């Protein structure tokens, strides 16, 4: 018997387990599908980045109707630490109105103001050296970055010279320097905060900062390489879980909690635990013979990610060195690795293929001459057209509320809808942060070893292509600006300066967009039950007691930014919520 059982030892689950076990009278068992990492260089060393070491095996999408019926491999972590163990270490908060919007969907206690203290509590910022801050244009607001919390973050101690050309080009096309992208707005260019521990220039993943740091505690239990296969109930009270070996041996074990079960199994894991447990849409559960404990049509609905596009380039005059020097110049690569091994300096402090700066933009910043035409098209179109006919009416109502919030964001000069990056080598990246499209993740069987059906539904809402085409065009402005023209860039096939119309551009984007950056969210959404929600503002699953969702399944919709910083802070927040109820 334990006080709490947590299903999934990723960012959210380890953060919560750490905080709960600060009380020696509280025992927690974290059951995690994947193993402990081995401190491999591909995990700890940014320049050695090997995220494939711990991908969840055997996940594939359905044919994507919005992307020429392409099927894609599905990327998500299977390891203690979850996504933090294998992600690109990009550490960014959302914008103020993300959290304010979640509140306004009917979630008391949710706002930028209520999240800020948890962002600060989550982390310790280590400032860069003064010379690098000056040379690099690295700025921050120390008043809103944490100084005492467990997640270490800082910056690489080096930048590739081409990053200077790109910064100045971005400024030339209306992306100015941002004082601090952690301050609730990020309109322009800034250094990428990185979840690195500057004492060793190694990854600060949740395994380290929310397990190893406190692993002397006897009340903090971990069971790697096991799957939570089912929640156990006494009436409507969640009292325990069943678990099985991840490797598929015909063993099943029950373990019980005295206070609560917490799901932390991620956007693609949490809904499957709920549905196998009889918490989910009665149509699906009836088809599979699963007895209904709580009829929640929102479970597995509302899937979101943040699509990506890689644009290939050739250069007549690129500057040396650059990220591609690591792969095409054995001498350079060896010298940089030796430099890192000796004094922890140089290119190996940057995640492999990343540069050091990035840019974020609102819809009006991307599309100053046409954003009102995009907003009009989106306003004109019934929210129901984005979902299959016969979608549960409560789920449609919640989608319409999300959509109305996002259209306000499209009007807001201080909320981002897209990200631009250049690694300094042969490609650029353009990310779509705020899709209106919604996907699904549903079990196909009662067998807990079976992958769910994963349908991103990328590009099914036609507004998304209008936003994404605008982001593409802004990226093209950067590469055509004076400070980048000196390097002699040109788009390579299948892009090219000869694609000038929205139709010509998007035809290629439809063939190249990746549905996912492994940012899967929002499949157990925090909205009122009558809006298709799965959890309350206190993250309690509707219709049962003693059961919460901690992982980013609970988010209503995607942020202006990537999820990691908010995955940590939301778990810090929930730990205090749980402590308040049980007087811990």
Ligand X SMILES: CCn1/c(=N/N=c2\sc3cc(S(=O)(=O)O)ccc3n2CC)sc2cc(S(=O)(=O)O)ccc21
Ligand Y SMILES: *[C@@H]1O[C@H](CO)[C@@H](O[C@@H]2O[C@H](CO)[C@@H](O)[C@H](O)[C@H]2NC(C)=O)[C@H](O)[C@H]1NC(C)=O
85 lies in the binding site for ligand X (CB under 6 A): no
Rg of the Cα atoms in the chain:
23
Q: Which stretch binds ligand NAG (CB under 6 A): 29-37, 138-146, 265-273, 326-334?
A: 326-334
Please give the structure tokens belonging to residue 440: 């699904």
Length of the chain: 584
167 lies in the binding site for ligand NAG (CB under 6 A): yes
β-sheet bridge partners, residue 314: 490
469 lies in the binding site for ligand FDA (CB under 6 A): no
Omega before residue 321 within 30° of 0, cis:
yes
Contact 532, 392 (CB under 8 A): yes
69 lies in the binding site for ligand NAG (CB under 6 A): yes
Contact 558, 522 (CB under 8 A): yes
3-state secondary structure 17-80: HHHHCCCCCCCEEEECCCCCCCCCHHHHCHHHCCHHHHECCCCEECCEHHHCCECCECCCECCC
Distance in Å, CB of 352 to ligand X, minimum: 7
Please give the structure tokens belonging to residue 116: 């800020």
Distance in Å, CB of 498 to ligand NAG, minimum: 4
Q: Rule CB under 6 A: choose which of 273, 293, 429, 478 binds ligand FDA.
A: 273
Q: Rule CB under 6 A: choose which of 200, 320, 327, 341 binds ligand NAG.
A: 320
β-sheet bridge partners, residue 382: none
**Residue 124 binding target from ligand Y, ligand X, ligand NAG, none, CB below 5 to 8 Å by type:** ligand Y
Size of the site for ligand FDA (CB under 6 A): 39
242 lies in the binding site for ligand NAG (CB under 6 A): no
29 lies in the binding site for ligand FDA (CB under 6 A): no
What DSSP letter does each residue of 508-525 carry, written as one string?
HHHHH-BS-SS--B-TT-
CA distance 115 to 511: 38
C-alpha 47 chain-centroid distance: 21
For residue 260, give the nearest of 42, 540, 564, 542 by alpha carbon. 540
7 lies in the binding site for ligand FDA (CB under 6 A): yes
36 lies in the binding site for Cl ion (CB under 5 A): yes
Question: In 3-state terms, what secondary structure has residue 547?
Answer: strand
Q: Which stretch binds ligand X (CB under 6 A): 7-15, 115-123, 146-154, 350-358?
A: 350-358
- Pick 198 or 387: Cβ nearer ligand FDA: 198
258 lies in the binding site for ligand NAG (CB under 6 A): no
Please give the structure tokens belonging to residue 163: 């990053």
Task: Please name the residue that has the structure tokens 């009558």.
Answer: 530
148 lies in the binding site for ligand Y (CB under 6 A): yes
122 lies in the binding site for ligand Y (CB under 6 A): no
**Residue 83 binding target from ligand NAG, ligand FDA, ligand X, none, CB below 5 to 8 Å by type:** ligand FDA
- Pick 374 or 433: Cβ nearer ligand FDA: 433
Q: Rule CB under 6 A: choose which of 113, 161, 199, 341 binds ligand Y.
A: 199
53 lies in the binding site for Cl ion (CB under 5 A): no
Interacting residues with Mg ion (CB under 5 A): 341
Interacting residues with ligand X (CB under 6 A): 51-52, 75, 88, 90, 351, 353-354, 431, 517, 562
Interacting residues with ligand Y (CB under 6 A): 124, 126, 148, 152, 197-199
């Amino acid at each position: 018997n334990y006080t709490f059982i947590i299903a999934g030892g990723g960012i959210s689950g380890l953060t919560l387990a750490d905080r709960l076990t600060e009380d020696p009278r509280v025992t927690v068992l974290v059951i995690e599908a994947g193993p402990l990492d081995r401190g491999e260089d591909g995990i700890l060393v940014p320049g050695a980045f090997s995220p494939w070491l711990y991908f969840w095996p055997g996940l594939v999408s359905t044919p994507q109707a919005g992307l020429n019926n392409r099927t894609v491999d599905v990327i998500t972590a299977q390891v203690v630490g979850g996504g933090s163990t294998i992600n690109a270490m990009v550490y960014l908060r959302g914008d103020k109105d993300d959290y304010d919007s979640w509140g306004a969907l009917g979630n008391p206690g949710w706002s930028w103001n209520s999240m800020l203290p948890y962002f600060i509590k989550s982390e310790t910022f280590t400032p860069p050296s003064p010379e690098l801050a000056a040379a690099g244009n690295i700025t921050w607001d120390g008043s809103i970055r944490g100084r005492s919390g467990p997640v270490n973050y800082s910056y690489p101690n080096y930048f590739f010279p081409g990053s200077e050309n790109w910064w100045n080009a971005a400024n030339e096309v209306g992306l100015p320097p941002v004082k601090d992208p952690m301050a609730g707005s990020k309109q322009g260019v800034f250094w990428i905060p990185s979840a690195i521990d500057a004492r060793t220039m190694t990854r600060s993943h949740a395994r380290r900062n929310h397990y190893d740091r406190v692993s002397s505690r006897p009340n903090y239990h971990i069971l790697p390489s096991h799957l939570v296969s089912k929640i156990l109930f006494r009436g409507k009270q969640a009292i325990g879980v069943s678990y099985i070996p991840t490797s598929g041996g015909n063993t099943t074990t029950n373990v019980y909690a005295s206070k609560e079960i917490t799901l932390a199994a991620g956007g693609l894991g949490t809904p499957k635990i709920l549905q196998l447990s009889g918490i989910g849409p009665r149509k699906l559960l009836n088809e599979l013979g699963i007895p209904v404990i709580s009829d929640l049509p929102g479970v597995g609905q509302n899937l979101q990610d943040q699509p990506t596009l890689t644009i290939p380039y050739t250069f007549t005059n690129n500057v040396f060195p650059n990220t591609d020097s690591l792969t095409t110049n054995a001498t350079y690569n060896a010298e940089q690795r030796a430099l890192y091994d000796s004094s922890k300096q140089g290119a190996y402090t940057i995640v492999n293929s990343l540069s050091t700066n990035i840019g974020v933009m609102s819809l009006q910043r991307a599309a100053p001459k046409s954003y009102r035409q995009i907003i009009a098209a989106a306003r004109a179109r019934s929210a129901s057209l984005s979902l299959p006919p016969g979608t549960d009416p409560a789920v449609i109502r919640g989608y319409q509320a999300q959509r109305n919030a996002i259209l306000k964001q499209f009007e807001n000069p201080n909320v981002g809808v897209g990200t631009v990056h250049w690694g300094t080598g042969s490609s650029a990246l353009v990310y779509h942060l705020k899709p209106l499209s919604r996907g699904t993740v549903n079990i196909r069987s009662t067998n807990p070893l079976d992958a769910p059906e994963i349908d991103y539904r990328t590009g099914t809402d036609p507004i998304d292509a209008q936003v994404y085409t605008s982001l593409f065009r802004k990226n093209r402005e950067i590469f055509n600006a004076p400070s980048m023209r000196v390097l002699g860039p040109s788009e390579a096939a299948p892009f090219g300066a000869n694609l000038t119309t929205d139709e010509e551009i998007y035809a290629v984007m439809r063939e190249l967009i990746n549905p996912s950056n492994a940012h899967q969210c929002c499949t157990a959404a925090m909205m009122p039950k009558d809006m298709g929600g799965v959890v309350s503002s206190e993250q309690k699953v509707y219709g049962v007691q003693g059961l919460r969702v901690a992982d980013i399944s609970f988010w209503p919709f995607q942020l202006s930014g990537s999820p990691m910083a908010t995955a940590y802070a939301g778990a810090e927040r929930l730990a205090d919520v749980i402590k308040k109820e049980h007087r811990l």
